[PDB]
Design a protein around this ligand. Structure first.
Ligand SMILES: [Mg+2]
Ligand code: NA
Length: 356
């Protein structure tokens, strides 16, 4: 079978046979991410990712005897799961207070490690003592992250997801009827839930100016109707010929939308009417659209390896907008995702086989 070490040469759907180990590794892994420990975090991810791809549940250390990205520091945490049935380590981090406050604080829109650590040291340990504290100061992001904390913690359905997609179209389609709005990210990977609904937008006719102002024009429109609860519009920071660095994104746009419950058709058929929704819009040149999709579809690990594989194996540089060959000193183009995979010389993996 020979299991590639790269997630991009692996098929990882949503059929995990090793959640037991997986959530242990993601916990331990996510802990080093909060522990500013960039190195061990990697280890756990590679390992966790790998397992998520296995077609069977590991029931003994013998089953490990082949898989890659399986280091000692790890098999030891694995061996504990196999026996105890649970993880002493994993369980520990769960109780660690620093961890717990970092997760909890960080779970607020506008809150990252910086501000997370800030509040920790100040002795804060809850979001109630944080909001109420008549001293601290908050960004508009944090105000918005807090103001709608409740709904944002809640997952987002495909119903709700699709519900948003209509909205994102009736708008975009209005200012650029020759534009394609495709849902990206996790839902595009086959997931039943997610925390933000992503969309990549592109247009053939779209001009520089047009493809630019479009994003404002849409949010304007949402503002005029009280659906825009938050909005941050970063202008593109990409030059066309700026090869993949060994930031730099298109005009993206983070925001919270007011999803009116009446527009969501689900098996469920109220208090406010609506639900706050995190939404990301990415605008992109029609000619680079194939890299943005590959760039905006899952997953961290898939994207992570796609890149290291690209470099370390093909002396090529993959981007969210280009694919440069350092050898042929030429920029490869792709009218599709399949082409890109083709270029890197990889069997095509589907969006749902990308949940590495
Ligand atoms: Mg996003
Ligand atoms: Na956050």
């Amino acid at each position: 079978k020979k299991i590639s070490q790269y997630a991009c040469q692996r098929r990882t759907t949503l059929n995990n046979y090793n959640q037991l180990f997986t959530d242990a590794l993601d916990i331990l892994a996510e802990n080093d991410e909060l522990r500013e420990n960039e190195g061990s975090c990697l280890a756990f991810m590679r390992a966790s990712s790998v397992l998520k791809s296995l077609p069977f549940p590991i029931t003994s250390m013998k089953d490990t005897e082949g898989i890659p990205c399986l280091g000692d520091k790890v098999k030891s945490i694995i061996e504990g799961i196999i026996e105890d049935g649970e993880s002493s380590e994993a369980k520990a981090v769960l109780n660690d207070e620093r961890y717990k406050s970092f997760k909890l604080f960080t779970s607020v829109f506008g809150v990252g490690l910086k501000t997370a650590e800030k509040w920790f040291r100040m002795g804060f340990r809850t979001l109630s003592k944080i909001q109420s504290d008549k001293s601290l100061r908050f960004t508009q992001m944090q105000k918005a992250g807090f103001l709608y904390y409740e709904d944002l913690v809640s997952c987002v359905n495909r119903p709700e997801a699709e519900a948003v997609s209509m909205l994102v179209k009736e708008a975009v389609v209005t200012f650029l009827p020759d534009a394609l709005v495709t849902m990206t990210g996790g839902f595009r990977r086959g997931k039943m839930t997610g925390h933000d609904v992503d969309f990549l937008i592109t247009s053939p006719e779209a001009t520089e100016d047009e493809e630019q102002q479009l994003l404002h024009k849409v949010t304007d429109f949402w503002k005029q109707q009280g659906l825009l609860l938050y909005c941050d519009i970063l202008e593109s920071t990409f030059e066309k010929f700026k090869q993949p660095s060994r930031l730099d994104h298109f005009q993206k746009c983070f925001l919270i939308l007011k999803l009116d419950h009446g527009r969501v058709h689900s098996e469920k058929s109220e208090g406010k009417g609506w639900k706050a929704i995190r939404v990301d819009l990415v605008m992109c040149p029609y000619d680079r659209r194939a890299f943005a999709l590959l760039g905006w579809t899952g997953s961290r690990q898939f994207e992570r390896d796609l890149r290291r594989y690209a470099t370390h194996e093909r002396k090529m540089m993959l981007d969210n907008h280009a694919l440069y060959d350092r050898t042929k000193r030429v920029f490869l183009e792709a009218e599709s995702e399949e082409e890109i995979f083709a270029h890197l010389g990889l069997d095509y993996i589907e969006p749902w086989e990308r949940n590495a």
